[PDB]
Design a protein around this ligand. Structure first.
Ligand SMILES: N[C@@H](CCC(=O)N[C@@H](CS)C(=O)NCC(=O)O)C(=O)O
Ligand SMILES: N[C@@H](CCC(=O)N[C@@H](CS)C(=O)NCC(=O)O)C(=O)O
Ligand SMILES: [Cl-]
Ligand SMILES: [Cl-]
Ligand SMILES: [K+]
Ligand SMILES: [K+]
Lengths: 219, 218
């Protein structure tokens, strides 16, 4: 069984949700870090990046780019995409909500600093009034441990990844959402996930002022 | 038999790719157009919109929001999402590229006016050097009429949609890409797509800064 190989910077960025999903599924993978503009040029010139961009994942004979394509493939392969078309529709709707909020956060430290504090408050309010209530409502309507089909899926994993990111941003945001808190604890305790949250795993740290400025300089 | 209901404004925006897919698949649908802040409030208050946003499509007993979720469901249901996991991976890769370029073009008339010149030039540079070559290469390497599995899929339909948007932007960008021209012709002459492209269909015009700087008030 040939191990998936992830090509990305040694950073969270657009590769983290893939690290989470693979690791939640107990799937062992290798990372090949891109450290120089030469490292990227080499992947490009080898014809390995369909749109000249990373992330790229080598898996089951394919050089897969585009985050959503990579994630969809992994989730079907490891039975984390529900069990039929309608379950997939619910999963997709949830993760796309997650992706909207998460995209706003991914792209917050690269925004204009005079309207960056306007952007931070906008997020915070969407979280409290838009997204966290939407997921709390799903959990409450099923009363089950999982968002869809009463079974672990990518939606649970990605929601919990998101709750970790929202906690780094402000710890009080989840405080009035008891069902989200319990989901985070439950998923964090699954064996694969617990292992991923432990030190020494492929899970990556947040980008700080140092690692961001250096990245832009060399690429 | 029992039609999908699309909830959006009377415009392309984020609902147009859904109109194209449903039309291509042979599926007749209804549109319930949002006209005021008050129609949108009703949708919200009635618990129709999971994240308070449109597009929303009522289909097969569900109330689906999020463009990609809608498209993904329609594509599987009507067998436009390939035959297996590996083909769906190709389709997904291709459609996500299309989406990236398509979003750049969607947001073009909305960027700060002073960035418009630079952004348009970068879009045209991406089209000529990144996107169109990628897709030309796929069609050339297989020698087939369709992008994936020698069979019609959403990737053909959504690429051809994008070739129409790019044509509106600049009709010369496709000129050095003969297999893209030929795919456009072929898909355009499929009866369902031909019908949808005819005058009178649910196909929507380009945004105008009339209906644009006025649909923000919704
Ligand atoms: N839609 C793509 C975006 C990929 C992307 O924006 N990659 C960036 C790095 S995070 C890149 O390789 N930039 C190089 C370039 O566009 O020339 C995805 O989700 O994978
Ligand atoms: N990622 C979502 C975006 C949906 C979206 O941005 N909808 C806009 C109009 S096109 C909206 O309902 N905005 C109202 C709001 O954000 O309060 C999708 O693809 O459906
Ligand atoms: Cl996911
Ligand atoms: Cl599509
Ligand atoms: K689930
Ligand atoms: K195809």
């Amino acid at each position: 069984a040939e191990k998936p190989k992830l090509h990305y910077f040694n950073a969270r960025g657009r590769m983290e949700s893939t690290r989470w999903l693979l690791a939640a599924a107990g799937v062992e993978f290798e990372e090949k870090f891109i450290k120089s503009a030469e490292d990227l040029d080499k992947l490009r010139n080898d014809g390995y990046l369909m749109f000249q961009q990373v992330p790229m994942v080598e898996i089951d004979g394919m050089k897969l780019v585009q985050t959503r394509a990579i994630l969809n493939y992994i989730a079907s392969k490891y039975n984390l995409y529900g069990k039929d078309i309608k379950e997939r529709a619910l999963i997709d709707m949830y993760i796309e909500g997650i992706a909207d909020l998460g995209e706003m956060i991914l792209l917050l430290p690269v925004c204009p600093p005079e309207e960056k504090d306007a952007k931070l408050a906008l997020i915070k309010e969407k979280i409290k009034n838009r997204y966290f209530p939407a997921f709390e409502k799903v959990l409450k309507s099923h009363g089950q441990d999982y968002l869809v089909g009463n079974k672990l899926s990518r939606a649970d994993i990605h929601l919990v990844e998101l709750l970790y990111y929202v906690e780094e941003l402000d710890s009080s945001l989840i405080s009035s959402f008891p069902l989200l808190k319990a989901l985070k604890t439950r998923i964090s305790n699954l064996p694969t996930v617990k292992k991923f949250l432990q030190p020494g795993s492929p899970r990556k740290p947040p980008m700080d002022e140092k690692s961001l400025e250096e990245h832009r300089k060399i690429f």
